[PDB]
Amino acid sequence: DEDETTALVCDNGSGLVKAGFAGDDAPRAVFPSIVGRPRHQGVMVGMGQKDSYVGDEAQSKRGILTLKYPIEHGIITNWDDMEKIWHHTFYNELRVAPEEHPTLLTEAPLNPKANREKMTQIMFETFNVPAMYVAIQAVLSLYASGRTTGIVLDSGDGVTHNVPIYEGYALPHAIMRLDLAGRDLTDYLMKILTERGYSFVTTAEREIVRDIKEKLCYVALDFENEMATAASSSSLEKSYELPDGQVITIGNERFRCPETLFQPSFIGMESAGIHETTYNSIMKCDIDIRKDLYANNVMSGGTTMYPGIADRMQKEITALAPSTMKIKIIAPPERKYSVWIGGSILASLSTFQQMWITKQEYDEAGPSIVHRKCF
Amino acid sequence: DEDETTALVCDNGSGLVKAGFAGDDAPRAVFPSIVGRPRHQGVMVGMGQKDSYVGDEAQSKRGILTLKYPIEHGIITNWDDMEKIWHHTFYNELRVAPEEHPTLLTEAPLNPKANREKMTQIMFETFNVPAMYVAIQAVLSLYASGRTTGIVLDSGDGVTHNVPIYEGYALPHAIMRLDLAGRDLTDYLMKILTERGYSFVTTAEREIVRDIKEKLCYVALDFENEMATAASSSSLEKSYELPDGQVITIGNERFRCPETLFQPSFIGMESAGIHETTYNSIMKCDIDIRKDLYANNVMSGGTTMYPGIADRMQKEITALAPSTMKIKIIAPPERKYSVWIGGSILASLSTFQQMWITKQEYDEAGPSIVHRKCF
Amino acid sequence: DEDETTALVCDNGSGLVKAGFAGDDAPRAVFPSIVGRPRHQGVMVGMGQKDSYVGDEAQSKRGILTLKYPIEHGIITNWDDMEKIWHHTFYNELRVAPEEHPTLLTEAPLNPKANREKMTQIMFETFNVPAMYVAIQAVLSLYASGRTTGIVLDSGDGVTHNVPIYEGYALPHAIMRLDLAGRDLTDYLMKILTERGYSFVTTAEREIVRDIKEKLCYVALDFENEMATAASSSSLEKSYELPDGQVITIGNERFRCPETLFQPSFIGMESAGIHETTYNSIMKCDIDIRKDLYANNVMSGGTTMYPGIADRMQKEITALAPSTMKIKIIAPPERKYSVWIGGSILASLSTFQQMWITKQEYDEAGPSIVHRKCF
Ligand SMILES: Nc1ncnc2c1ncn2[C@@H]1O[C@H](COP(=O)(O)OP(=O)(O)O)[C@@H](O)[C@H]1O
Ligand SMILES: Nc1ncnc2c1ncn2[C@@H]1O[C@H](COP(=O)(O)OP(=O)(O)O)[C@@H](O)[C@H]1O
Ligand SMILES: Nc1ncnc2c1ncn2[C@@H]1O[C@H](COP(=O)(O)OP(=O)(O)O)[C@@H](O)[C@H]1O
Ligand SMILES: [Mg+2]
Ligand SMILES: [Mg+2]
Ligand SMILES: [Mg+2]
Ligand SMILES: [Mg+2]
Ligand SMILES: [Mg+2]
Ligand SMILES: [Mg+2]
Ligand SMILES: [Mg+2]
Ligand SMILES: [Mg+2]
Ligand SMILES: [Mg+2]
Ligand SMILES: [Mg+2]
Ligand SMILES: [Mg+2]
Ligand SMILES: [Mg+2]
Ligand SMILES: [Mg+2]
């Protein structure tokens, strides 16, 4: 065990399951969210004997299993494979058990009543846990980023948050989520890059969909004004060779997939987009922090990593805004771990320990104990 | 055409615009206020050819469009969609044109100078009209209810009025609006029912927001004493099955939404709510009708529909009050259309015709014609 | 601490609480009169830990709080929040204590019995005071102006007086207050500007009420003959920009808000107003000082700041006058602070020191010590 003060620190997210201890900058435990039921008698029998695969190794051998994930766009839909994922989150990758030792969780800026009582409950159930606390991603992100006032653009394998937060305090009312960040994005990219040609199909040709997007993506300066030249000329569409090898032009997906993060009308939605929200939660925030809110625009996480978005954030927020107000967008592309950083860095501290629930106050009160506790 | 007098009647409101002729009860013209610009080339092209949908069919087909409305919280924010709305509200569903025929409008009890001058103009511009006028909602809503004297609480898709009327006359100086009734209501419900679980999100899961609150909501007798038993038991938060069909426990919103109409310290403001206003407007008024105004509290609009709301009324006007004075609580829940109702009935008469603005007396003195005119 | 004679000076008003020591000009202490219970669990919980805000950092940070004021039109209406106001006023902003040191107060020209006997008990209760006094605003403002014989016109956040003071002496009979200066003013402006347009609504859009009147208000030369060409032309009503940035037009409010001062029929009242008050108290006074009263009209307060008001006095006081007796309106717009100026400068003096109430003679007399004592 480490010297740094005893907590487990587990960031629930939608792409990769991040967990670790107190003190760090990059994740101790990384794994995607999967547990796969194998299925065959005949050839599974014929060839194998052992197993079911989880996360890491399940990236490797997989064409023998049944690959579903168990969490989606937020609160866990079935927490059943989440349980054995958390079993895996504790008992070999870190290796330490939450049985003796204190434990933290992250959460969205504000969580609900009922399932977040049952969140508290599940820790005490299967995992036993003598002390747990649960702290906000946005607030901890901004403390990772070192700051006192900053409106944190979060955006993961699923959700985008836009929290106004002033000297540590997020604001009670200015609340909106975009549920665009990861899947709809990537798997409409699967939809289209497949119609463009080759069945990314069954046993061989599937998770190239998940290599490709990340490498190809700059967010362009404007759309159909490039898509005109694009088609007469031949530049931004690059002929790339994959583990099979036929001439693959990937070309819009680059700017297209994240132009959807701006405006979902490019798949086809009548509803909103990121640009509006960013401003709109500030326009329904507080008048004398509105000021500093536009003037402290910051970002966190996965889908934010993309090159071209400072150029977009300086472009289109100002494109709604008055003549009188002013935006300041702030840059740092370290940001792909900063929630797990914020959790890890805050875990270590003297101050934070007294704020723990002790399991004695669970048994006394119930899981509703969480509703008078975590700040 | 009807036998009953040549006079069109529009009741505008922020939610569903109501209009018709002279004499009726329930509305002749109903629609919700959308036109929304169609957007795609490619898949709009491939599949269709026609359209762009006003109102009616834009609650049938819509996941192609760009769904925005234009009447928000009172005075018209952009009237360009209102113009083509009014081009629907006249030309196809009622069908009968303003060109030869007299026309009437509804409005709040007292209106300003210029954004009512141009309304008088804009009716004579696009729609030409050889005669027109506009009535207050308050009083027509009261003569509808059958009464000479009455403090009516309005509450519809955005606003609440708490309007003191005695013998046909409202009182010249006690004037407060509560800008809550429809949206911050349903859409704060959107916010926290979404955090309770399922991104209600893109093409398929959205307008259950506006189906669910209507059925589920009642006004309860007290709040965090009921939120106590709540979290121990499993009573008042039922499970129901929607167009998809996962277990949706819908729970507080029922009683939490309408409590926010009363005390808006339940999203979290800082800052008023109706219980006060319903009294405040009367404490500010003539001492010899303070009397009867507390003795003649009445109600109108759709957000008024709720079960338990009289129970909330009788409780918490009285609970401010001195030992001396006395509240009556007058019941009528017919009152969902009372504002369109009386404009229909009043359009029928003899008396009201002489009042009409004639196109000639407009052209003479300008759009201020209404300043000296509208009783 | 300063060299100048040990004495605290609270010029209590019903807008911004002000204070300081002796010898000065502009305020040493200024804070708006707000403390205010924050409310929530859940999101308040989630997003902070400490606090409830007084005045200053309330005038910052406020959308989390429960904001009411405790002094209204004149004498305080519950002395509970006024208490923790004075607790702030002494112990952090001046920092000093009324524990060791002598303490002065401000008041209107003469005051009543009971609650001012009690204004001799609260400062000796919690705040202890070994030596105290209270003096008259009107009179102090006139020696602040460096003069002997004046009728001063006050007008602050709520209230207005019309006081003869001749060679130091106010006349014991000539007396009428006006209760229009601050709130009814600004918050009928909120009411009418609200009817004109956009809800000054809930979290973001509410104190642009207070800000807009001050800058925009001139008194004008006459009302409805200006409101004629107002509608026909487009002159006085300016299109600015606020933190929102829609084309807000402010227009009458300028002249109508100070019109309603002189003539409160521009919301709607049956009783009086100012010009006659300013004439009548001198009509009801000694015959041979009438002369010098009408010939020494002088003003102070915040609300007396509006441009045009000089030309208004010189018009509508003299409009009531006979041919024989003559007015002389005196101009100084130094006058936003003049009563506290009155107290601070007068607190220095050797003369005034023998006038103090020692806490010893309070303990002997009880509350009735100020009755014989104060001049
Ligand atoms: N460099 C990058 N470029 C493009 N997309 C990225 C990059 N890094 C991460 N992402 C995207 O971010 C998502 C994962 O972000 P993350 O914040 O880790 O989600 P979570 O916390 O919810 O697990 C993935 O869908 C991934 O494609
Ligand atoms: N049965 C009902 N229960 C609760 N709310 C209702 C009911 N019927 C209508 N409403 C509400 O009434 C509001 C609209 O009322 P209405 O007075 O017609 O508004 P408007 O005149 O401004 O169009 C809506 O926001 C709707 O949810
Ligand atoms: N520049 C100004 N123009 C007009 N009104 C003003 C100005 N400055 C302050 N006021 C008004 O003066 C009032 C407060 O005056 P003040 O004498 O300080 O009141 P108080 O002594 O009772 O605190 C408020 O209604 C405020 O809007
Ligand atoms: Mg995350
Ligand atoms: Mg564009
Ligand atoms: Mg769109
Ligand atoms: Mg708004
Ligand atoms: Mg503010
Ligand atoms: Mg503790
Ligand atoms: Mg209505
Ligand atoms: Mg209550
Ligand atoms: Mg409140
Ligand atoms: Mg009052
Ligand atoms: Mg009376
Ligand atoms: Mg006529
Ligand atoms: Mg004063």
Ligand SMILES: [Mg+2]
């Ligand atoms: Mg006049």
Ligand SMILES: [Mg+2]
């Ligand atoms: Mg009058």
Ligand SMILES: [Mg+2]
């Ligand atoms: Mg005499």
Ligand SMILES: [Mg+2]
């Ligand atoms: Mg003495």
